[PDB]
Amino acid sequence: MDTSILNLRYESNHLIDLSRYASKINIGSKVNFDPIDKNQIQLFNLESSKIEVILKNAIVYNSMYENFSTSFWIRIPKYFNSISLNNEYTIINCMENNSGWKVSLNYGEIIWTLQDTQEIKQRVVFKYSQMINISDYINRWIFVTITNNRLNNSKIYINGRLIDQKPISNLGNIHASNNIMFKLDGCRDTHRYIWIKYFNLFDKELNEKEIKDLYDNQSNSGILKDFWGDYLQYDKPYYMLNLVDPNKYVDVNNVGIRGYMYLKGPRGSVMTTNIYLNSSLYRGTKFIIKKYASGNKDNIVRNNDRVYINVVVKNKEYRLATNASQAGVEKILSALEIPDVGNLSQVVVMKSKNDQGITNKCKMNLQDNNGNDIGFIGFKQFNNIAKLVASNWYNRQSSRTLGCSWEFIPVDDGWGERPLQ
Ligand SMILES: CC(=O)N[C@H]1[C@H](O[C@@H]2[C@H](O)[C@@H](O)[C@H](O[C@H]3[C@H](O)[C@@H](O)[C@H](O)O[C@@H]3CO)O[C@@H]2CO)O[C@H](CO)[C@H](O)[C@@H]1O[C@@H]1O[C@H](CO)[C@H](O)[C@H](O)[C@H]1O
Structure with a gap:
């Protein structure tokens, strides 16, 4: 029929x-x-x-x-x-x-x-x-x-x-x-x-x-999407939005193993009087997704692809990483010199689906170097600073919106904002 x-x-x-x-x-x-x-x-x-x-x-x-x-x-x-x-x-x-x-x-x-x-x-x-x-x-x-x-x-x-x-x-x-x-x-x-x-x-x-x-x-639900709904790509710089804390953006206080990635504010607004008024989207440290285990020659990020995440600080690339070895649920993420990552954990499993079936907004499940989950990347309020963490607490949770949901935003002519830096 x-x-x-x-x-x-x-x-x-x-x-x-x-x-x-x-x-x-x-x-x-x-x-x-x-x-x-x-x-x-x-x-x-x-x-x-x-x-x-x-x-x-x-x-x-x-x-x-x-x-x-x-x-x-x-x-x-x-x-x-x-x-x-x-x-x-x-x-x-x-x-x-x-x-x-x-x-x-x-x-x-x-x-x-x-x-x-x-x-x-x-x-x-x-x-x-x-x-x-x-x-x-x-x-x-x-x-x-x-x-x-x-x-x-x-x-x-x-x-x-x-x-x-x-x-x-x-x-x-x-x-x-x-x-x-x-x-x-x-x-x-x-x-x-x-x-x-x-x-x-x-x-x-x-x-x-x-x-x-x-x-x-x-929906092409085996393929992760950027914020606009296009295919998420490797090697393409993106601004990050956390849906649960949308007035903040990602920053790095200092590069290296004694620094940390965190959410800072305000995002600010873009406007043209009586035509539009929206949150600024081109804010914070850009993320670049890098190939690790993907077999496909093309630049498309697929569900369950195993990747690295680079972060851009002052126009230079660093590696998202953490030390998984201390006890404690939340592992604070840092931006490392790529040549000096050593034995830190960096492999991320990209997810477009909650389970085999149900489609969720982008998630990044960080792995240790024995291949065990360290947990979804989100954030944790450590008193006055919301630091980015990987945490299995997120993996154990309902299908409500949590702090591990992200959107990847590239510059697009249909949005029209000017990048400040
Ligand atoms: C509400 C909260 O803090 N949830 C944490 C969770 O914290 C547990 C427990 O719920 C909490 O009551 C206790 O907090 C006490 C603290 O430990 C004491 O030192 C203090 O004197 O009093 C506090 C209140 O009695 O701490 C416990 C952990 O030690 O722990 C889980 C991890 O198992 C999470 O950290 C959870 O917070 C979530 O963390 C997420 C990331 O993993 C995410 O950031 C969520 O935002 C957050 O809700």
Whole structure:
């Protein structure tokens, strides 16, 4: 039982339809594909930055009663300018002669619109704030699912969860376009772009289980993610965020075995008046993940990869390490001269999943040199200083949010902050 009417995927050297219908795909000259993952497609605010799918005539939506759904991932750069404030722009267009469906965006909004041949319309909308300290949505990959049941509602899901639903049983015949245009249409911000991936159309209303499964399956959950949702990489400098203490950042008081890594504050804020106000993300000692036991030639960090962690202090690389030999649960982490690590413990097991199954935010399980767990890396308040530690206390704990959850943040043009140093 195959409900896919379009499944747009990058294979070999081409974007192609992997559905049974084999619709034709025309790509403009200014479409960018991410080298690390060519399924990630960047569309600028330019006439030539477009992808047009010409649908088989027989699968064009033209009905009073047929249910259908769409799914895709999107990464939306922060809105930077007041010209975006009240400017709805189409991004995925299947409207013709004022009937059909489309996906549009606006300041802090993702919008679905349906319209019948008598111009009766209904919309469902996801809204997100740009005035939030740490956003789950701004410039981070979002999984969108929209379902349409002609007997009752359109529904919009975000990361597998229902956000909005609205009645559409009053709409009559909807006759959509023969082509789907992926293109910024009516956007007045000349600098705007989006990233998109994994666009699908389905000839049914997807149920909650199907949507959750699709989210889980397209998540690439064997691969660790950076803060934006891209693949976490080796050899790439990252700023660290601890989710349980998000107003602080990592620093090293002094390099060497008598120093320690710790959380210090304030992070401070980035703002453009009445457009955004967020915590500064480009703060503290950068981490670089290094290959240790990975067999893959590529630069991708996978679940259970055994690695080293380097830390950058005054533009020079040091090794994250601890002495595991004294009794005591928490092992304070230091930044060591790489040539002088000696018999200190440094091997880290990178985790994208809680157990074989359940996906968690990044964790780093430090090993001793006999291969026993020293514990997940987090932090411990030693009176007035929160020092970074590895601690098996974390390993024994529920599935609540703990101090061992981290995000890895690289500099990205959709965020727009300037690195201070
Ligand atoms: C709440 C707390 O401190 N939890 C610790 C845990 O501490 C245990 C025990 O819970 C605690 O009551 C006791 O604290 C007493 C102290 O030892 C005495 O010297 C003092 O006179 O009075 C204190 C209160 O009676 O200490 C115990 C440990 O010696 O110990 C575990 C390790 O087994 C953890 O350290 C736990 O704190 C967690 O540590 C985590 C990292 O491992 C992480 O940082 C968590 O933030 C933190 O909750």
